[PDB]
Every structure is written in structure tokens, then in C-alpha cells.
Amino acid sequence: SSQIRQNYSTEVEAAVNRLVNLYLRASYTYLSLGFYFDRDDVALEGVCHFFRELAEEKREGAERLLKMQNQRGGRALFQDLQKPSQDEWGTTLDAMKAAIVLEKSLNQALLDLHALGSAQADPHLCDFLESHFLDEEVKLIKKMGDHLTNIQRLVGSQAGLGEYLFERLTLKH
């Protein structure tokens, strides 16, 4: 057991394990989003790429949390990972709305863990979240919001055409 643990509450330890589960589930959701847009009957490569990149980012977030858990002397505990909430994700607009909802949920879990850390006077935990997660999340949510607005402007006009142009001229492919 732990010869190193210092100022690391059982409450934070458990919440970090829950947050790892939430990041891995987000990664899984993004994997499903990504492969949906690779279907021959959907075929939006840029959209596929955008969500596959987010699957990787979320998995890396989970790995960084696990590394931190060990650095503090806590013990990683893994739970089952729930499948994503949908099997088909609709249009680019539907998908980007679902992604923003998911990110807001992750952001709220980060903020809740920051508050717990503040309450338990665990500055290392607070700084770790500040330095590696909170600003990344704000930037991502802003980028998703920007995308949502641009998609909305395009598919109001003419939906098929608008969806193609967004994929071609905004997303990387």
C-alpha cells in the first residue's frame, strides 16, 4: 500500500476514479460518432476525423488522471463502461449538439471535482485540473459552439448542400 500518500482524501480518490470512467465513456461515444460518419451512406470524412480525434483526446485525459492517481498514492479502480447512448447519430448538426451536451457534462464533473478539492484543501489536485483540463475544456466547447453556429447557418439555407460545404471547408480532411 502507500508509503507516499499525503493530503489525498478518500473522497477525491473515489471521485478521480469516477472521472476516469466518464472520460473513457466519452472516448467510447466519440469512437461511435466517428465510425458513424465513415458509413458509406453518411460519408462525411471531415466529421469522422473530428470525432476520432476527440476519442483520442478523451482517452489521453483518462490516462493522465490515472497517472495522477498513482502519483498521489491512490488506487485506480475500473468499472464497466456503458455503451454510447445512440447507435446512429443523425446529421452533422444532431451530432455536434450531442457532443456539446457531452462536453458540458464532463466540464461540470471537472468543476465538481475542483470544488471537492478546494473544500478538502488539496491544492495539487486543484492545480492539476486547472493546468491540464479546465482551459482545454473551455476552448473545446467554444470551438463546438462556433461549429454549431456555422452548421445552423448552412442547413437553414439548404440542408444537404450546407452539410457538405461545412465538411469540405471548415473541417480538416
Q: Give residues in contact with Cl ion (CB under 5 A).
A: 82
Residue 58 binds what, of a copy of itself, Cl ion, none (CB under 5 to 8 Å, by partner type)?
Answer: none
* Cβ 137 vs Cβ 106: under 8 Å: yes
Q: What's the CA gap between 96 and 103, in Å, rounded?
A: 10
Residue 1 binds what, of Cl ion, a copy of itself, none (CB under 5 to 8 Å, by partner type)?
Answer: a copy of itself
Residues 6+ apart with CB under 8 A from 64: 132
Q: Is 14 in the site for a copy of itself (CB under 8 A)?
A: no
* Cβ 116 vs Cβ 15: under 8 Å: yes
Cβ of residue 170: shortest distance to a copy of itself, in angstroms?
A: 7
Cβ of residue 145: shortest distance to a copy of itself, in angstroms?
A: 4
CB nearer Cl ion, residue 70 or residue 79: 79
Determine if residue 63 is labeled as part of a ligand binding site.
yes
Interface with a copy of itself in residues 126-155 (CB under 8 A) = 126-131, 134-135, 138-139, 141-142, 144-150, 152-154
Interface with a copy of itself in residues 81-110 (CB under 8 A) = 81-84, 87, 100, 104, 107-108
Determine if residue 57 is labeled as part of a ligand binding site.
yes
CB nearer Cl ion, residue 81 or residue 138: 81
* Cβ 116 vs Cβ 11: under 8 Å: yes
DSSP line for 49-113: HHHHHHHHHHHHHHHHHHHHHHHHT--------PPPS-S---SHHHHHHHHHHHHHHHHHHHHHH
CB nearer Cl ion, residue 85 or residue 118: 85
Q: Is 32 in the site for a copy of itself (CB under 8 A)?
A: yes
